Amino acid sequence: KVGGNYNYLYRLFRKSNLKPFERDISTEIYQAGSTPCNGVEGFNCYFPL
Amino acid sequence: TRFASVYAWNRKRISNCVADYSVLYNSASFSTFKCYGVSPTKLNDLCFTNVYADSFVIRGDEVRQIAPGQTGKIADYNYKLPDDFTGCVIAWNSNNLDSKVGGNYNYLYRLFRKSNLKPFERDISTEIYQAGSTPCNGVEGFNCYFPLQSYGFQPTYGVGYQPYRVVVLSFELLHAPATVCGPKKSTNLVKNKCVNFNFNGLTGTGVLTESNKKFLPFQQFGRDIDDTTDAVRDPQTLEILDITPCS
Amino acid sequence: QVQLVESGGGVVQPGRSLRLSCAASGFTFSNYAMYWVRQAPGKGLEWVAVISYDGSNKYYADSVKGRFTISRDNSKNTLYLQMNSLRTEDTAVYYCASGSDYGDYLLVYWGQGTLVTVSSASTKGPSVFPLAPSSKSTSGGTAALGCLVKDYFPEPVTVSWNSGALTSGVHTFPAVLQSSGLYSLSSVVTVPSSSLGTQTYICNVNHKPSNTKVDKKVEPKSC
Amino acid sequence: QSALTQPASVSGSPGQSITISCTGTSSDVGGYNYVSWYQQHPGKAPKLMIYDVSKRPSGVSNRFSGSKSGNTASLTISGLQSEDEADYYCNSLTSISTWVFGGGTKLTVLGRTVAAPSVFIFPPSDEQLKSGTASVVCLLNNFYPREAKVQWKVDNALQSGNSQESVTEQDSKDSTYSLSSTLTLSKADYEKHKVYACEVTHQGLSSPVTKSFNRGEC
Ligand SMILES: *[C@@H]1O[C@H](CO)[C@@H](O[C@@H]2O[C@H](CO)[C@@H](O)[C@H](O)[C@H]2NC(C)=O)[C@H](O)[C@H]1NC(C)=O
Secondary structure (H helix, E strand, C coil): CCCCCCCCCCCCCCCCCCCCCCCCCCCCCCCCCCCCCCCCCCCCCCCCC | CCCCEHHHCEEEEECCEECCCHHHHHCCCCCEEEECCCCHHHHHHCEECCEEEEEEEEEHHHHCCCCCCCCCHHHHHHCCCCCCCCEEEEEEECHHHHCCCCCCCCCEEECCCCCCCCCCCCCCCCCCEECCCCCCCCCCECCEECCEEECCCCCCCCCCCCEEEEEEEEECCCCCCCCEECCCCCCCCCCCCEEEEECCCCEEEEEEEECCCCCCCCCCECCCCCCCCCEEECCCCCCEEEEECCC | CCEEEEECCCEECCCCCEEEEEEEECCCHHHCCEEEEEECCCCCEEEEEEECCCCCCEECCCCCCCCEEEEEECCCCEEEEEECCCCCCCCEEEEEEECECCECCCCCEECCCEEEEECCCCCECCCEEEECCCCCCCECCEEEEEEEECCCECCCCEEEEHHHCCCCCEEECCCEECCCCCEECEEEEEEECCCCCCCCEEEEEEEHHHCEEEEEEECCCCC | CCCEECCCEEEECCCCCEEEEEECCHHHHHCCCCCEEEEECCCCCCEECCECCCECCCCCCCCEEEEEECCEEEEEECCCCHHHCEEEEEEEECCCCCEEEECCEEEEECCCCCECCEEEEECCCHHHHHHCEEEEEEEEEEEECCCCEEEEEECCEEECCCEEEEECCCCCCCCCEEEEEEEEEEHHHHHHCCEEEEEEECCCCCCCEEEEEECCCC
16 A cells, blocks of 8 residues: 555564464563663563564 | 764774674663664674774764665765665764864765765765866865865754764675684583583583593593594683583 | 863953963863853852864853953963953952863863952052950850951952960951952951950951051950 | 852751752753753862763762753752752853853751851941941851841941941861951941941841940940
8 A cells, every 4th residue: 555554564573483373462562671671561672563 | 082074984894803792782872773684682693704893973863874775965975885784783872072062073074976985985085076067176166165064063953963973883704714703601510410511512411520531732522432522621621521421 | 180270360450451361281172162160259150251172163141242252272272361341340260161071061170260350449558457355245254356457459368366376266257349349358256254354366467469467456345 | 140040058967868950041951951060169169060961970979860851950969968068050051052050059968956156246446437437347156057147237227238248168176157247337427326236147046136236335
């Protein structure tokens, strides 16, 4: 569509690769808190989709 | 404390060293970090034959131009990258240091060129540009303008105007043995237990013990008559260990 | 440590030209902008115009704009301020500051400063007047007596007491500008009742610019 | 100068935390986050330990913190100590490209208990009266904290404009301060009136203290 269809999304990254035919809907920001990144719930560490 | 003006960006060659990238992506001081075809943590995992590092000063709005498939005054006239650029870009804000009350004219950037730079092409020429019908041929005057521009890094401007410092790094192909790598792990040793081990590349499972065998200074690990690993030298304390298969 | 020393404090009539300077050491003076700051006795800090790192640009505040001009020497690591249209209120202590690696817009490093004196009078000696002890000042066996200093030209003056040896407590206060355009201060010493009528108390006032000293004695009044 | 506005004074016990605000027009403060703060000590030039509102230079205590809000920026001093007792000033850069200082704020850290002043009054000297001028002096001795107020009264009628107040530095042993007030009058005006008085007010006193002398006695 003109301006780009935003109805289709892909997983930018995950903790570990999926198992065959695995499916997940878990959409939570990957920050893990801790010293490396912003505390959990934060948006510093991008977004999963 | 001598960051290069973008029109004459400097280049640094790094080789034969342990490239510890852990601090770089852990440090929050870097306002922007970007890797094209590469991942941050993987940099410690990866090894390269040789890597370069470029540095230049540009304001916030111009930082957006440092990327493949991007254009602009900085990207085209000062510093151009290829679209297949397999490297990373690091930038951070330097407003207080770079900005001067009346504008930091000690830094310069190119305004004119007769053609856009090819990838990694460098040009510090100062020929007076022909901005009109007059064949200036290096003489100042009407429609005859100095190709370079001095930075107006005044403190009294917003974030977009304020200066930034940028570092761009890339790595060569595997035409020869690698020379730069991320730091390796060095865990505590164990004895008289069945363990998995990976000393340098030697990987195996067995119970360990210090023995009487006398390796020469250059020998790293022993071998048996049947060609099975039979001893190993600890690379931290250089003590000689002996390996026995797990019962 | 980065150091700045201000020099050029002088005594001058109002309106007549005057010069202020300060030299830097220990860093790249040419790299950073420079500032001037002035402070009055018992008051806050006031800002003075700025000059760029290379001296190509300047910005002034209206209170000093036009009256004062700022210049720099990057080979001598020194700063200058050319002054005109001075007033009595312009009498103050002036500091100069600079930016640094922290920021070019910061007043990071400061010197001890120098003093500027402006008034319409000419060289004159001071006068001292005693403040005798009395029943009004005496309370709980302790009496207070002091000396007062009349104006002079130029500044400054200081006060001392024979109580410097007779170690009883002594207090002196910063001078205050009178309507005459010259400053005055007070000096006091607290003494016991028994000493009154039995020991002499003396106050001394110094005026170096004219190499003049004045002594005054205090004797109890019947009050 | 067109100085930035700051609160007059604050006080607290050692170890407490106090904040000082600095405010100005949008162009002065709100325009940019370059606010900085200065500290001065007796007989010394001012020192700057702040930059970009919150950052701490080297050779600076860890007890300084700052924040910005709207047209105002504030500095917080935690772990108050006796060394912190001073007058504090703020500076900001205007869109005019000129730097502006604040009016000042005085902070007190209560390292010692309150001390009330001893009040004394002085008539003019005989020699000055013979010269042709009259000056009257009032003394405040060894009080803490530093803040104090004084009034001059002649024939129990208040006077203004003809007197000035001065204050000493800190006492080297008592940690207290002293204040002086001097009133000047002409010989005819001195002859007109007969009673002269000075009045003092302090934090630790429930009501002002008045001292006076009579020309018929002094
Ligand atoms: C690797 O590093 C370790 C730790 O610093 C070295 O171990 C020390 O070696 C010295 C002798 O050079 C001993 O005196 C110390 O007691 C050792 N300390 C520890 C904690 O091991 C080791 O020698 C180094 N080896 C190499 C090859 O660099």
